[PDB]
Design a binder for this molecule. Structure first.
Ligand SMILES: *C/C=C(C)/C=C/C=C(C)/C=C/C1=C(C)CCCC1(C)C
Length: 208
């Protein structure tokens, strides 16, 4: 279990460093914003993972709290989504993470179920907007933006959907997956979402 944590920490740190240095050689005002958000996300995750090493799993949850909104923001900026749409997405993200926590704080099965159903419903709304709403918006934009968004979209929807699955079969849920393995799964997901997506985004001309 300690290894996945050390691994996660290292991968997040290197991802952050890489995005930071890569961004230095960029001056485009549009590109810089993406570098800002994209570098900040793994920076936040690194801090939390390193913290878990120093210790702890609520720390990882807290990083989800900070990073999910920024990831959504990254996508919103790519398709130049209007403020309202973005606020709604971020608000839904807060509900997702918020209810996930409240459901975790309740001991009675029925309340937990509803809180997490609400959390899942919030995630589904987010995935719907990205997949359907953002896709039409991207297809009316320059080819590079449309193509890069489609890839980020596909990756995002797959990775995000995996979290509740792992959560539901892990120690917070049915208790089928051992803490040891769950930590591994969430680390792979976190790195893929916060370093993998950034790589795809920042290596594209779509940010200019
Ligand atoms: C870097 C971290 C990322 C992209 C984290 C994403 C986390 C989620 C999409 C979590 C979703 C959950 C539910 C839909 C139900 C309740 C439990 C959660 C919080 C694991």
């Amino acid at each position: 279990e300690w290894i996945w944590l050390a691994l996660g920490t290292a991968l997040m740190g290197l991802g952050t460093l890489y995005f930071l240095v890569k961004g230095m050689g960029v001056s485009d005002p549009d590109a810089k914003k993406f570098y800002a958000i994209t570098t900040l996300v793994p920076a936040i995750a690194f801090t939390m993972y390193l913290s878990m090493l120093l210790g702890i799993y609520w720390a990882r949850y807290a990083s989800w709290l900070f990073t999910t909104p920024l990831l959504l923001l990254d996508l919103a900026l790519l398709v130049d989504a209007d403020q309202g749409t973005i606020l709604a997405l971020v608000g839904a993200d807060g509900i997702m993470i918020g209810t996930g926590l409240v459901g975790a704080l309740t001991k009675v099965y029925s309340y937990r179920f509803v809180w997490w159903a609400i959390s899942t419903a919030a995630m589904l709304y987010i995935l719907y907007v990205l997949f359907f709403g953002f896709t039409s918006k991207a297809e009316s934009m320059r080819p590079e933006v449309a193509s890069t968004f489609k890839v980020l979209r596909n990756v995002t929807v797959v990775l995000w959907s995996a979290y509740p699955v792992v959560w539901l079969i892990g120690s917070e849920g049915a208790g089928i997956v051992p803490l040891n393995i769950e930590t591994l799964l969430f680390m792979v997901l976190d790195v893929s979402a916060k370093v993998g997506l950034g790589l795809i985004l920042l290596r594209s001309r779509a940010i200019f």
